[PDB]
Structure formats: C-alpha cells, structure tokens
Design an enzyme around this catalytic site. Structure first.
Site, PDB file in Angstrom:
ATOM      1  N   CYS A 159       0.883  -1.052  -0.073  1.00 43.68           N
ATOM      2  CA  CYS A 159      -0.027  -0.024  -0.081  1.00 43.68           C
ATOM      3  C   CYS A 159       0.771   1.314   0.187  1.00 43.68           C
ATOM      4  O   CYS A 159       2.181   1.367   0.460  1.00 43.68           O
ATOM      5  CB  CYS A 159      -0.988   0.071   1.298  1.00 43.68           C
ATOM      6  N   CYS A 171       0.815   4.133   1.801  1.00 42.30           N
ATOM      7  CA  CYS A 171       0.949   4.600   3.047  1.00 42.30           C
ATOM      8  C   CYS A 171       2.508   3.937   3.669  1.00 42.30           C
ATOM      9  O   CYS A 171       3.174   4.574   4.454  1.00 42.30           O
ATOM     10  CB  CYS A 171      -0.086   4.763   4.217  1.00 42.30           C
TER      11      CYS A 171
END
Lengths: 147, 143, 147, 147
Positions: free
Chosen positions: C56, C58
């Site tokens: 992902c 983040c």
C-alpha cells in the site's frame, strides 16, 4: 491471489456462454455436474448423441455445427441429445467419459449411445483436420445405422 | 458480459497500479482529482502517465520509482494517471502539459502546475533502465 | 496451479522486491516463514521494532521511511529491527501477529517489543493520514519509553 | 531480460488469453507471427475477414462480438477468418498492416479480403461511436457484396 483468479474465471465463464447456448439452444441438454451425468446416463433410453464440447477452434468450426445440423437435417435421429463441456465442467465430463469404455479422452468428441453403451464414437482426430461434410456424413451414417 | 470485462481489467491492472503506489505515488483516478491536486500542488511533482504496455512495465515504472527512492534530490509530490484505464483523469492531466504531445507511458516534472521537464514515450521506448534514470535524476537535480 | 495463477504469483513476487529492499537496505531482517519468525522471537532479547510491510501507498510514503529515519535519528533505539511482508509472506505475518495479542491486524503497522512481549503498537490508522513528523514522533517517543 | 520483464511478459501473455479465445472459440485462426502472416496472405484464396484485435473496451464490446456474430449469423461469409492481436503480437500486426495499402493503422479494426487485396476496410472510427446493429450491418453488407 484469488481476487484476480475469481475475475479470470468469471470472465471465461461469460465468454463460454455462447459456446454453450450454441448446443443448448439446439435442444442439447447440458450436464454440468457429475450427479447430473449419472442421473441422465442411468435412466437414458433409446439412442443418445453425446457431444463433448470444448473452447478450441475446431469445436466451434466443426464439432458443434456438425452435431446440431446432423440432428436437425437427418431423417433418422437420436432420441436424446446432451453435452458436457470439457475443461469447463470437469467433473461432469470426467463422469461422462467413465461410460465410454475403451475410449481415450479427447475434446471435442462425440458418442452415439444405445442406452448407456457407446455404439459409435467420434474422437477429436476424426473431427480436427476434416471438413463439415465429412463429419456430418460420419454422424448421419451412424444415425442411420443405429437410430 | 460488460461487468465481467470491466471487472476483468479492473482486477488485472491492479498490480501495474501497485508498482507505483508501492513506491509512494498517489493515484489520481478522476478528472476532478487531477484538477484538485494541480490546483493545490506546491513545489515539484513527478507525474507518471502509466499504461498497460511492456515498456511501462520494464522501463518507465521501474525507472520512475527507483529515481525518487534513490536520488538525493526528489519531487515533493509523486502522482500518476493511468492512460487508457482512467481515461478522463488522463485527458485532464494531459491538459496541464501545454507543450507536450500525448504518449504513454510518459513522465512530467512540474513546478507548481507548469511542466519543467518532459519524458515522452520515445525517450523511454528503445532506452535502458540506467539511461532513463539519469534523465530523471538530472531533472531532479536541476529543479 | 494453472498458468494464469502461476504468472500472477511470479509477477507479484517481482513487484514486491523493491518494497522489500527499502527495509533490508536499512538493516531490517526479513522474516519470511512462520518458522523464521518463531525462531527469531524466542532467542529475541532486548527491544525489537517489527515493521509489518505492505504493498500500500502509506507503507511506501510513511511507514518505511519513518521507520528507517527513526532508527537512525535517535539515541535510544531498539536492539533488533525485523520485518514481515503482509499479503506476500502470509504465514510469516500471521505467525508474527500471534505475538501481537491485543493489537488488531493492519498494514502497514509497526510494533515495539521487549523480548517477545509487545509494549507499543502503531496501527495503519496511526500511519495513514499522518505526517512523517507525528509518526516518528510516535516512534521515537516509544523508543524513549522502552528502549 | 530480468525477472521483472520476464514475469511481466508472461503475465500479460496469460491475461490476453480470454481475448484470444473469444475469437478462436468462434473459428478465427490466429496469426501470431510475421512469418505466419506472410505464409497466410501469400497463399490466401477466396475471401477473408481479418480482425485486428486489441486490448481495449472497444474491442471487447463491439469489435469481437460483431465479428463473431456476423460470421455465424450471415449466409455469405468469408472463406477464411483470421486475426492479429495489435499491441501483443506486434510483428504479426505490422506485417498484416503492410498488406493494407493506403489504409491508416488503428485498433481494433477489420479488413475484408479477396485474395490478398483489401476489398473493404473498417477502421476504429467506424467501430467506436457505434452500436452492434450498425457494425453488423456494415460487416454483413460487405459479406453480401463480396462474401
């Protein structure tokens, strides 16, 4: 992961639909389940044309068209018509093939039954590389011999 | 069928998206999102115009991601539009590139919303990793 | 086990390589099997920062950088630094998560340990939507309290 | 070639398989190579429908279905049905496109052939922006006229 795999199967499922309807819309009953195959075969009476369907070009160009046309055009014709879809309904076709004593597996292929006994078999090599005329003459000569 | 297909591409392009988001690139998927980002954007930005081809896979994406990760000077923002998959997002972003012709994959370095350096497909296609890297890194070092 | 799924696996395996090397480049030992994980946690002494890595955005933008910047910019720092890759090394991160009783599973996430017991946890929602500042402030603070 | 490039190519290869099968399961022969194109076009006789396939919503929703429906619902049809996959089989489609004197490259697109001469051509702008009904009329009218 399964997400991509789910999507792939759904997509292939959708593309395969017209490949089924080609036969089923012509009165060939789908047996999509090992249980459905047993059910039909253990009750079948008289003559049956079984079509072992497939995604490949020669199922599309030869087998399906020949099967549906022979059945609609010939005076003498089988009492029943059914199909299993190799590669798509695996358990169904593996179960149908159990009844084809003596035969090796191939796809597409066709069997003419009397009861649940094969009286005429058309393996893939009798289909691939040949033309419609030859294959329909194959089927119809079998219908005349047995139906 | 339509569902199964659009769903099909939606699943299978996920990885090509992840290559960039896995490098910290922010995905702008609508014209609206593009407009919103370019209006707020401050400092430098690497825009990667993604696509589903082989040079995107083997050249552009790896080149863009390594550059930002391993270069000493880097864009303050990293964003991408997916050519052909997010069509409208792509068309919108392409409007901020007043001087550049459309191609994918392609890459743009911005200061504000003004293009300051551009890498068209033809500077990616037919080149190798390092070559494209240095093109990016020199850009980063200059702006 | 078919060709599509084999190909998907091969592709994701390579996709993920760069995301692994950002951490291993900074001294984080990869724990890729349940057994490596099991093995590490037992002979583990002092403090360990575990980074649960992720594909992902983040993870890329916040977790990994914060983790590496944190371990370097601080007088107090963990004795050990290791990582597991959520979604890619599924058995590895599921094994590690068993030593994280009390914390909900998420990714990226980070945990601080004394020995084999978790003494601090940073969930994805304490990462996603946060600044590099608050995250390593979170991290470094925890280091000060425990390391 | 490295692991990524190799994994990626194989991945794309497997993912376009359904978009190949949609045509091959309709009887279309694939020309996957420059040599396979020359070999075909050089010896081609009668009439041929060529489908320039591609990976895109236009191909998926119009071109492929239209081509397959027209070919099987219409009385007159080409003697041959062939396809080159633009973007995927690049040497094959470049080679085929050399046969399209004075036509512009686009995908998806279709050509009706008499021998190796382009007797009618449908570009993307005839496909995109239209529905099945329109493309089908276009196709089958071409067939009615030449075959």
């Amino acid at each position: 992961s399964n997400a991509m795999s789910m999507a792939y199967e759904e997509y292939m499922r959708q593309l395969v639909v017209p490949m089924r309807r080609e036969l089923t819309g012509a009165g060939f009953e789908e047996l999509t389940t090992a249980e459905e195959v047993e059910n039909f075969m253990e009750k079948a009476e008289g003559t049956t044309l079984v079509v072992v369907n497939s995604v490949c070009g020669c199922a599309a160009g030869l087998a399906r068209p020949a099967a549906t046309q022979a059945v609609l055009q010939n005076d003498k014709t089988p009492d029943n018509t059914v199909t299993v879809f190799a590669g798509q309904d695996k358990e169904a076709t593996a179960k149908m093939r159990e009844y084809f004593t003596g035969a090796a597996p191939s796809s597409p292929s066709m069997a003419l039954l009397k009861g649940k006994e094969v009286v005429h078999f058309i393996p893939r090599h009798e289909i691939e590389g040949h033309d419609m005329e030859e294959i329909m003459k194959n089927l119809t000569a079998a219908f005349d011999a047995h139906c």
